[PDB]
Amino acid sequence: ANFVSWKSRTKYTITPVKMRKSGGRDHTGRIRVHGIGGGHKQRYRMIDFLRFRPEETKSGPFEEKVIQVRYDPCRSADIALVAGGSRKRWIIATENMQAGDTILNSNHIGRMAVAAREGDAHPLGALPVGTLINNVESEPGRGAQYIRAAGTCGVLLRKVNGTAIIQLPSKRQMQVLETCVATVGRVSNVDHNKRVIGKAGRNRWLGKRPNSGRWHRKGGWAGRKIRPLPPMKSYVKLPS
Amino acid sequence: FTPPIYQPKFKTEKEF
Amino acid sequence: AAPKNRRTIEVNRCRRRNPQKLIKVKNNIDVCPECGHLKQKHVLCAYCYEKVCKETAEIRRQIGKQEGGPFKAPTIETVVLYTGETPSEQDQGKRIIERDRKRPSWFT
Amino acid sequence: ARGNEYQPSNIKRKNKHGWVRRLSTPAGVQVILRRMLKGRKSLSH
RNA sequence: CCUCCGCAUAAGCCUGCGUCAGCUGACAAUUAACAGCCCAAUAUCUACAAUCAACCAACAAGUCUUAUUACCCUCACUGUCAACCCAACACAGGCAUGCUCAUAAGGAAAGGUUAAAAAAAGUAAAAGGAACUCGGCAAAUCUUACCCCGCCUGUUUACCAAAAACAUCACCUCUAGCAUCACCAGUAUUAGAGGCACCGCCUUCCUUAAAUAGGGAUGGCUCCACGAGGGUUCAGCUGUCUCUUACUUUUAACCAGUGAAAUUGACCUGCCCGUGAAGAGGCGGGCAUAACACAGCAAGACGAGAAGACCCUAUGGAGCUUUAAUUUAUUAAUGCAAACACCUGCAUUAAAAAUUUCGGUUGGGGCGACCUCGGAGCAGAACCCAACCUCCGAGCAGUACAUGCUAAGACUUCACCAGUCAAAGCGAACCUUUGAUCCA
RNA sequence: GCUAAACCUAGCCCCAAACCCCACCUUACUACCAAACCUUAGCCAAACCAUUUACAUAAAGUAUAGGCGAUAGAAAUUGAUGGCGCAAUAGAUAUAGUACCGCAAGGGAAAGAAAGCAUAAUAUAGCAAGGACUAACCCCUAUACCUUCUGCAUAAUGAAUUAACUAGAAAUAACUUUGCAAGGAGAGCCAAAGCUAAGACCCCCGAAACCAGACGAGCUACCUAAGAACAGCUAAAAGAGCACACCCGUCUAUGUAGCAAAAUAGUGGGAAGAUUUAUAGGUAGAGGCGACAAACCUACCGAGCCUGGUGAUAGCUGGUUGUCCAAGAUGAAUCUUAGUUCAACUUUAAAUUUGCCCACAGAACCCAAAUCCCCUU
Ligand SMILES: [Mg+2]
Ligand SMILES: [Mg+2]
Ligand SMILES: [Mg+2]
Ligand SMILES: [Mg+2]
Ligand SMILES: [Mg+2]
Ligand SMILES: [Mg+2]
Ligand SMILES: [Mg+2]
Ligand SMILES: [Mg+2]
Ligand SMILES: [Mg+2]
Ligand SMILES: [Mg+2]
Ligand SMILES: [Mg+2]
Ligand SMILES: [Mg+2]
Ligand SMILES: [Mg+2]
Ligand SMILES: [Mg+2]
Ligand SMILES: [Mg+2]
Ligand SMILES: [Mg+2]
Ligand SMILES: [Mg+2]
Ligand SMILES: [Mg+2]
Ligand SMILES: [Mg+2]
Ligand SMILES: [Mg+2]
Ligand SMILES: [Mg+2]
Ligand SMILES: [Mg+2]
Ligand SMILES: [Mg+2]
Ligand SMILES: [Mg+2]
Ligand SMILES: [Mg+2]
Ligand SMILES: [Mg+2]
Ligand SMILES: [Mg+2]
Ligand SMILES: [Mg+2]
Ligand SMILES: [Mg+2]
Ligand SMILES: [Mg+2]
Ligand SMILES: [Mg+2]
Ligand SMILES: [Mg+2]
Ligand SMILES: [Mg+2]
Ligand SMILES: [Mg+2]
Ligand SMILES: [Mg+2]
Ligand SMILES: [Mg+2]
Ligand SMILES: [Mg+2]
Ligand SMILES: [Mg+2]
Ligand SMILES: [Zn+2]
């Protein structure tokens, strides 16, 4: 198929980007994921998940003003347009982020624990043990990948050597170098769970479609079955 | 069902 | 229902050459003593009727030229006059349709 | 109800059965070659 | 007198009711302003819907470029017709958009006649008013109440099923800790899959005159609303019916024109009884019997339509499922070597699949029996004789270890295969049932 | 006397020889902008199927291979222009790869120089005739044909009818007739009268299928991009009510070779949404797509269509065309009882010598009819 991904923009921008829906199809044109299709037309707002991104010809911790907190069609969490120096960027808004607030993004691992104020981003080494965090990186400077959905909050369980143990919202532990940055507090839109879709049409607006034949293997869906051993073949299904 | 079979048009379009 | 056997030409002849199917000879045909044309006793002579229809059509064309437009039917009688004819006393007060030919013998 | 499966559109006609698409693949080139060998007046659609 | 018609655009088609002279040929024609055919780049830009956009109301969150550097020449090219396209057709079908909402546009239901049946559509109907019928189907007319199922709006077997089936919000379970082609430019309040079903709470009588109808005396319940769902009912309504009739239109029949299809061994093509490949126009015995049109009918021609439906067969297909058989080539895991993450070879286990098969005889109300060999009867007396026929028995043992070797002539399970008997001779001594070939 | 009949070359078949201006890959036929190579499979045979089979001469169908079975199968060595063709349903598909059919791949023609009727309907009764007769009918006799069956007028199959076309291909071994003859044969091979040569003998149509490679998402299913439509009333931001356009297709009737290969009329459901819909693009066949109906994927989808393998295979059905004569009829095994092989029967040819019938004699104990056997005849 003549499918070219719409994710071709190379330069970061604030403007919402016109994103092409996939319908759950590969570049080959065949369905790869089922139940996707239709829904409201959406525009993509490029989110900068590297919270500590010092501006060009600049370095060190910097502050930013929350221009606004906006609903994002492409996420559960709501985003914030936040401006610093002479640039603006979209970030993931925390629970109590408000327009006009100030946000601190630092790479300084202070000897003492920095007072953890919701919304600011510090290296994990600088946080008190047990602080709620989100937008966690796996590697230093990789960019936030974990704890990004609405209302999610990991916990900085432990800090030893240059390694911190985080509890992801799935209650699984993760080891990350303490130099990797994370933002304090739980992600915004904490009430995302309680939202009631109400009708099938609303899911269809959200781009979820009812789709059958989701397996494509011979016989369709087949739950795993325990294959008996020769000794147990005699008792697999004892007639009543 | 079996589809109808059409006979060639030349047979019925002949003219003197 | 479909035929159970092809009908033979002998049966078909017995059917389609029956007198009921044959054309009957007409015996009401005669000669019009006026013009000698053939006519049926109860029907008008075709040739004479054609004469009358053509003359009527010409007279009606003259009437249409005189009236000049739809919905102009006169409220007065009409009289047709041919070349060399003059409105008579009883033809007074009647619209005159003038024909360029001479009075037909059958027209009185 | 049926029978009118052909809904003509010159764009689809040319994009689907045209000379350019026929030459776009070796299989289509062989389609053209077969038509040429048979002597078809119309090699492509 | 009639029309959701008409005029344009789009799309499609491609000269396809313009003129002329004989459907054919010739001749003519649609003229750009409408429409199409575009843009010199590099970068940098571009958070703030729309809905009369002002309040108000949100959620589904919603087409949004200047600076600099180059550059002056100018209106080319193409579509323009029609009664038109997709449906084999001058096809009652399909066919986007803008305006006209009954037309200022566009059209003609009747070839002529007659006024039969049957048939279609419609109108009216005494009294009655569901007695019709599977069912109030259809029609006519207003309504009541209640059950079953599914929560709901939706979807589906294009062309016999629109439903209680599918989906669905809700809920539960399982799997996944992660980025540059889907999921996703997402990240556990996420994503994928499966199940379930909104939600919420606990663990003989009545109906009728007559009632095989209807209603009521994790699980158990709760039906708010909805439904061309499935049942029952009051009232009304009615030609559904008692019980049909009248009229109009179509059809019809006659006249004129044009003119098919299935079908058809030949037919000079009767009835009764009998017979027969078991249902006779055709044969036997009787009866009847001039010859032909036309209109009706549907009892027969085991009437015509598809080598119908259903059932059985074929060492015929194909689909599906598996603890049917054979594989793991391919992927995924591991392990061992091989190169110092990636990759090759070899094994093992899986996943996914792939190929192939469906023995025979018997048994209608079962839950199987049988399949080879032998004895007895059927089959009495040479031999031979079946069965889902009536009974019985066997898959070897005991013995010895000439129970060795050879060899005339014979028998033979109706073929062959196989299976039997055996003189003489040599050698020791002094016997009474199961199965081939190949392959090992 | 109409329709018609006829015709002969247009060409073709098999051999031999010879090696044969301009426009156009963009939406082809449009003057001019910044990347190829990779085992065929399967039908089929094995009577299923699974390994397997199935894409000069001579040595020799030998060595070999092989569910050692169907079958497959060497090499060393040897050395080597014409027509008892067609002649317009034939011969090329061909007047043309045109017309026409199909979206496409692709399929693919035709043709040029008697029957049926009419002259002239018809006569009791009957397979339509025959025996006849003075005489057409009247009289008497007479149950179409083919195929499939134990048996068919059968109310079993096929056939309207005419013309044309349309179906028995071959080995091993025999036999017959020649040649030569312990040798024959024009190397090879055979030979204990053989060898050499000739003569005679082995059908047609038909599946559902399987696989390879193409072609198809202008219908339909779903999806992508960017569009468009939704009156009026009621209600207020609604998968809201009634109801147009629009979409659908509940029920009834009509239609059923129809207006229509799914329609018409009425009735009915939705009708601001999970709506409907134009345009362009995508997903492709064991695949796609699917609010799972086995639904849809160009009218016939439990797996499309086309071409090829392919003249698939068919123990099954049907068909199998001059004359005449003669002989000619009821067990065993088998994935076998719709078939086949052996036997029995049958036919032909040949050799030589008993064959059938058949009395007497003869053939069991246990517990009838007859049969067997054979001197004579
Ligand atoms: Mg369409
Ligand atoms: Mg008319
Ligand atoms: Mg009429
Ligand atoms: Mg009444
Ligand atoms: Mg009743
Ligand atoms: Mg009532
Ligand atoms: Mg009754
Ligand atoms: Mg009704
Ligand atoms: Mg429902
Ligand atoms: Mg249907
Ligand atoms: Mg539908
Ligand atoms: Mg229906
Ligand atoms: Mg009742
Ligand atoms: Mg509904
Ligand atoms: Mg007529
Ligand atoms: Mg009888
Ligand atoms: Mg008969
Ligand atoms: Mg009659
Ligand atoms: Mg049959
Ligand atoms: Mg024997
Ligand atoms: Mg086979
Ligand atoms: Mg050699
Ligand atoms: Mg020819
Ligand atoms: Mg003749
Ligand atoms: Mg018959
Ligand atoms: Mg039969
Ligand atoms: Mg027949
Ligand atoms: Mg499409
Ligand atoms: Mg409205
Ligand atoms: Mg609504
Ligand atoms: Mg659907
Ligand atoms: Mg189902
Ligand atoms: Mg089913
Ligand atoms: Mg099809
Ligand atoms: Mg065959
Ligand atoms: Mg004889
Ligand atoms: Mg066997
Ligand atoms: Mg058989
Ligand atoms: Zn006269």
CATH of the domain at D26: 1.10.287.3980
- Extended beta strands in chain A, E state: 17-18, 43-44, 62-70, 79-84, 87-92, 102-105, 121-123, 132-134, 136-137, 144-146, 154-160, 163-167, 173-177, 181-184
Kindly report the length of chain B: 16
Deposited experimental method: cryo-EM
Task: Dihedral sign for Cα A202, A208, A209, A215, please.
Answer: negative
The domain spans of chain A are: 1-106, 107-187
Q: Which of residues 161-190 of A touch strand E (CB under 7 A)?
A: 168-170, 172, 174, 186, 189-190
Q: What is the dihedral of CA B6, B12, B13, B15, to 10 degrees?
A: 170
State the total domains in chain D.
1
CATH fold group of domain A1-106: OB fold (Dihydrolipoamide Acetyltransferase, E2P) (2.40.50)
Strand partners, A68: A81
D12 CA: nearest nucleotide by C1': F218
| Residue B10 dihedral angles phi and psi, to the nearest 5° | -60, -35
User: D18: which residues sit within 8 A by CB, 6+ positions away?
Assistant: D44, D45
Give the structural domain span for D35.
Answer: 3-45
CA of A218 to the centre of ligand 32 (A): 16
Query: How many residues are listed for chain D in this entry?
Result: 45
Q: List the one residue out of A115, A145, A118, A112 whose CA is nearest residue A133.
A: A118
What does the radius of gyration of chain B's CA atoms come to, in whole angstroms?
Answer: 11
A180-201 burial, b at 16+ Cβ within 10 Å, e below that, comes to bbbbbbbbbbbebeeeeeeeee
Whether the beta carbon of A30 falls within 7 A of nucleic chain E: the reply is no
CA distance C99 to C82: 5
Look up residue B1 and give its DSSP letter. Answer: -
User: Phi/psi at A36 (nearest 5 deg)?
Assistant: -115, 135
Q: Provide, in whole angstroms, the distance separating residue A23's CA from nucleotide E14's C1'.
A: 41
Which chains share 3+ C-beta pairs under 8 angstroms with D? Answer: none
Q: How far is the CA of A23 from the centre of ligand 30 (A)?
A: 28
For residue C10, how far is its CA from the centre of ligand 25 (angstroms)?
Answer: 24
* Locus of tokens 């069609």: A73
CB A175 within 8 A of CB A7: no
Residues 190-219 of A with CB under 7 A from strand E: 190-193, 195-203, 205-206, 208, 210-212, 214-215, 217-219
Ligand nearest to the CA of C44: 39
DSSP A157-224: EEEETTEEEEE-TTS-EEEEETTSEEEES-BS-GGGTT----SHHHHHHTTB--------STTS----
Q: Which two tokens stand for residue A90?
A: 């979209």
- Spanning CA of A150 to C1' of E427, the rounded length in angstroms is 110
A118 Cα–ligand 21 center, Å = 80
Q: What is the largest CA-CA distance in chain A?
A: 81
Separation of C14 CA and F149 C1' (Å)? 43
Residue type, D34: R
A98-127 residues near strand E (Cβ < 7 Å):
none
Encode C40-102 in three state secondary structure. ECCCCCHHHHHHHHHHHHHHHHHHHHHHCCCCCCCCCCEEEECCCCCCCCCCCCCEEEECCCC
Instruction: Please name the chains neighbouring B, where neighbouring means 3+ C-beta pairs under 8 angstroms.
Output: none
d(CA A58, CA C18): 120
Give resolution in angstroms.
2.5
Which strand F nucleotides have any atom less than 7 A from protein CB atoms?
24-30, 37, 96-110, 116-118, 121-122, 160, 213-219, 222-226, 239, 260-263, 273-275, 279-284, 287-293, 295, 298-300
Is A4 within 7 A of strand E by CB distance?
yes
The answer to whether residues C48 and C34 touch, using CB atoms and an 8 Å cutoff, is: yes
C21 C-alpha to center of ligand 3: Å?
22
From CA A180, how far away is CA A163, in angstroms rounded? 10
CATH label, A107-187, candidates 3.40.50.360, 3.40.50.720, 2.30.30.30, 3.30.470.20: 2.30.30.30
Do residues A127 and A156 make contact, with C-beta atoms less than 8 angstroms apart? Answer: yes
